[PDB]
Design a protein around this motif. Structure first.
Motif, PDB file in Angstrom:
ATOM      1  N   UNK A   3       0.930  -1.318   0.104  1.00 22.30           N
ATOM      2  CA  UNK A   3      -0.275  -0.036  -0.279  1.00 22.30           C
ATOM      3  C   UNK A   3       0.999   1.244   0.366  1.00 22.30           C
ATOM      4  N   UNK A   4       1.423   1.471   1.085  1.00 27.21           N
ATOM      5  CA  UNK A   4       2.731   2.432   1.020  1.00 27.21           C
ATOM      6  C   UNK A   4       3.522   3.047  -0.330  1.00 27.21           C
ATOM      7  N   UNK A   5       3.929   1.777  -1.117  1.00 33.36           N
ATOM      8  CA  UNK A   5       4.793   2.464  -2.279  1.00 33.36           C
ATOM      9  C   UNK A   5       3.767   2.317  -3.552  1.00 33.36           C
ATOM     10  N   UNK A   6       2.572   2.300  -3.660  1.00 33.58           N
ATOM     11  CA  UNK A   6       2.401   2.292  -4.807  1.00 33.58           C
ATOM     12  C   UNK A   6       1.431   3.739  -5.555  1.00 33.58           C
ATOM     13  N   UNK A   7       1.948   3.956  -6.741  1.00 35.33           N
ATOM     14  CA  UNK A   7       1.390   4.836  -7.901  1.00 35.33           C
ATOM     15  C   UNK A   7       0.625   4.612  -8.679  1.00 35.33           C
ATOM     16  N   UNK A   8      -0.064   5.526  -9.150  1.00 36.41           N
ATOM     17  CA  UNK A   8      -0.681   5.572 -10.546  1.00 36.41           C
ATOM     18  C   UNK A   8      -0.401   6.655 -11.047  1.00 36.41           C
ATOM     19  N   UNK A   9      -0.025   5.901 -12.923  1.00 43.02           N
ATOM     20  CA  UNK A   9       0.275   7.007 -13.453  1.00 43.02           C
ATOM     21  C   UNK A   9      -0.825   8.083 -14.347  1.00 43.02           C
ATOM     22  N   UNK A  10      -1.438   8.825 -14.822  1.00 45.61           N
ATOM     23  CA  UNK A  10      -2.077   9.432 -15.340  1.00 45.61           C
ATOM     24  C   UNK A  10      -1.597  10.260 -16.309  1.00 45.61           C
ATOM     25  N   UNK A  11      -1.991  10.283 -18.163  1.00 45.27           N
ATOM     26  CA  UNK A  11      -1.383  11.324 -18.432  1.00 45.27           C
ATOM     27  C   UNK A  11      -3.321  12.047 -18.725  1.00 45.27           C
ATOM     28  N   UNK A  12      -3.433  13.716 -18.609  1.00 48.01           N
ATOM     29  CA  UNK A  12      -3.888  14.386 -19.084  1.00 48.01           C
ATOM     30  C   UNK A  12      -4.218  15.438 -20.143  1.00 48.01           C
ATOM     31  N   UNK A  13      -4.536  16.152 -21.150  1.00 46.52           N
ATOM     32  CA  UNK A  13      -4.226  17.349 -22.431  1.00 46.52           C
ATOM     33  C   UNK A  13      -5.314  18.437 -21.931  1.00 46.52           C
ATOM     34  N   UNK A  14      -4.523  19.287 -22.078  1.00 48.78           N
ATOM     35  CA  UNK A  14      -4.473  20.707 -21.857  1.00 48.78           C
ATOM     36  C   UNK A  14      -4.013  21.920 -22.688  1.00 48.78           C
ATOM     37  N   UNK A  15      -4.920  22.848 -23.348  1.00 47.59           N
ATOM     38  CA  UNK A  15      -3.785  23.936 -24.135  1.00 47.59           C
ATOM     39  C   UNK A  15      -2.957  23.106 -24.985  1.00 47.59           C
ATOM     40  N   UNK A  16      -3.227  22.061 -25.322  1.00 48.88           N
ATOM     41  CA  UNK A  16      -2.130  21.845 -26.734  1.00 48.88           C
ATOM     42  C   UNK A  16      -1.314  20.902 -25.962  1.00 48.88           C
ATOM     43  N   UNK A  17      -1.623  20.542 -25.113  1.00 44.25           N
ATOM     44  CA  UNK A  17       0.149  20.231 -23.877  1.00 44.25           C
ATOM     45  C   UNK A  17      -0.463  19.152 -23.457  1.00 44.25           C
ATOM     46  N   UNK A  18       0.422  18.167 -22.647  1.00 40.52           N
ATOM     47  CA  UNK A  18       0.167  17.158 -22.264  1.00 40.52           C
ATOM     48  C   UNK A  18       0.827  17.449 -20.806  1.00 40.52           C
ATOM     49  N   UNK A  19      -0.198  17.019 -19.515  1.00 41.88           N
ATOM     50  CA  UNK A  19       0.164  16.980 -17.812  1.00 41.88           C
ATOM     51  C   UNK A  19       0.145  15.691 -17.048  1.00 41.88           C
ATOM     52  N   UNK A  20       1.584  15.219 -17.096  1.00 38.56           N
ATOM     53  CA  UNK A  20       1.880  14.302 -16.618  1.00 38.56           C
ATOM     54  C   UNK A  20       1.752  14.125 -14.990  1.00 38.56           C
ATOM     55  N   UNK A  21       0.414  13.084 -14.346  1.00 41.29           N
ATOM     56  CA  UNK A  21       0.479  12.723 -13.226  1.00 41.29           C
ATOM     57  C   UNK A  21       1.150  11.950 -12.036  1.00 41.29           C
ATOM     58  N   UNK A  22       1.454  12.208 -11.616  1.00 45.48           N
ATOM     59  CA  UNK A  22       1.597  10.104 -10.530  1.00 45.48           C
ATOM     60  C   UNK A  22       0.841  10.798  -9.526  1.00 45.48           C
ATOM     61  N   UNK A  23      -0.165   9.724  -8.609  1.00 45.95           N
ATOM     62  CA  UNK A  23      -1.102  10.094  -7.728  1.00 45.95           C
ATOM     63  C   UNK A  23      -0.721   8.576  -6.937  1.00 45.95           C
ATOM     64  N   UNK A  24      -0.258   9.088  -5.541  1.00 47.05           N
ATOM     65  CA  UNK A  24      -0.242   8.579  -4.286  1.00 47.05           C
ATOM     66  C   UNK A  24      -0.998   7.466  -4.391  1.00 47.05           C
ATOM     67  N   UNK A  25      -1.470   6.362  -4.588  1.00 52.46           N
ATOM     68  CA  UNK A  25      -2.673   5.871  -4.053  1.00 52.46           C
ATOM     69  C   UNK A  25      -3.942   5.718  -3.491  1.00 52.46           C
TER      70      UNK A  25
END
Ligand SMILES: O=C(O)c1c(CN2C(=O)Cc3cc(Cl)ccc32)ccc2c1OCO2
Ligand SMILES: O=C(O)c1c(CN2C(=O)Cc3cc(Cl)ccc32)ccc2c1OCO2
Lengths: 149, 149
Positions: free
Chosen positions: A1-23
């Motif tokens: 549990x403590x070490x698990x993260x989720x990657x997520x990629x979303x788009x805005x203004x023609x650019x990409x935002x890469x996100x890591x969430x600590x689940x």
């Protein structure tokens, strides 16, 4: 549990935002890139794993899951790279809702920054400090400290 | 002291490495920039304060202490901006020793990356994980968790 993260990629203004969430906590780190590539994702993961004790990453799509550059960075940093399949269906919607909320925060600060990258880091700050009761930044530290002890 | 960080700027390969140290733990975050401007320092501080509960920063020189852009970012993020004068003279040497050790780590990985920015993030990873017995990454989390509770 403590070490698990989720990657997520979303788009805005023609650019990409890469996100890591600590689940377990909902704490995030994010960056703006011109497009998602293996090289950008690999560098993002190296940054993340230097900062928090990242054991497992659920990748955001099959291109990053396959990427030899992403697998190289996971090997280097000691990360188990996993698929990001919502075997638990509430997960599509949870990432959906996170992106929606981020974009909302970004809209609330967007005028205070010339460059989208500043607005995204203001949004990361606001998200991580929101109590709405602890904040996500408090939860992640409690979780990992409990893990160490 | 859980919220105190020190900024440090060091030079390598004709580029500048900006470092923030969390003074009580020795945990660091760093980035490569082409040169140390108020704008770059301000963005670095916004990034850092979105990630850790940064209450005070001792700035690395008088240009960043004076910079209206740096003061704007410290205002936005709720940070008290302070001078970095080593009233306690063991401080010049400790900052010196940190840069020399970072540069040694960078030289040990420098061949595994094409771009200096990758080698600096590898060096951040190795520094933060080094056991010295806890690592710096463990110390910082235990410190802040003890502070929340
Ligand atoms: O409000 C949200 O849905 C939200 C969340 C929700 N969140 C959690 O609390 C735990 C979690 C796990 C995952 Cl896998 C995705 C999102 C979240 C995280 C980060 C955010 C959010 O909004 C902006 O940043
Ligand atoms: O070994 C070091 O000298 C070192 C340090 C030493 N360090 C601490 O442990 C506490 C501290 C406070 C300050 Cl204000 C500066 C450096 C350090 C920190 C970060 C590093 C280091 O080497 C690379 O990254």
């Amino acid at each position: 549990s403590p070490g698990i993260w989720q990657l997520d990629c979303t788009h805005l203004e023609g650019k990409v935002i890469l996100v890591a969430v600590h689940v377990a906590s909902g704490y995030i780190e994010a960056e703006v890139i011109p497009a998602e590539t293996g090289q950008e994702t690999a560098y993002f993961l190296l940054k993340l794993a230097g900062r928090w004790p990242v054991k497992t990453v659920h990748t955001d799509n099959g291109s990053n899951f396959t990427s030899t550059t992403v697998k190289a960075a996971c090997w280097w940093a000691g990360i188990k790279q996993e698929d990001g399949i919502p075997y638990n269906p509430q997960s599509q919607g949870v990432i959906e809702s996170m992106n929606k909320e981020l974009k909302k925060i970004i809209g609330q600060v967007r005028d205070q920054a010339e460059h989208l990258k500043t607005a995204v880091q203001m949004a990361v700050f606001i998200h991580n400090h929101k109590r709405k009761g602890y904040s996500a930044g408090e939860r992640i530290v409690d979780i990992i400290a409990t893990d160490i002890q």
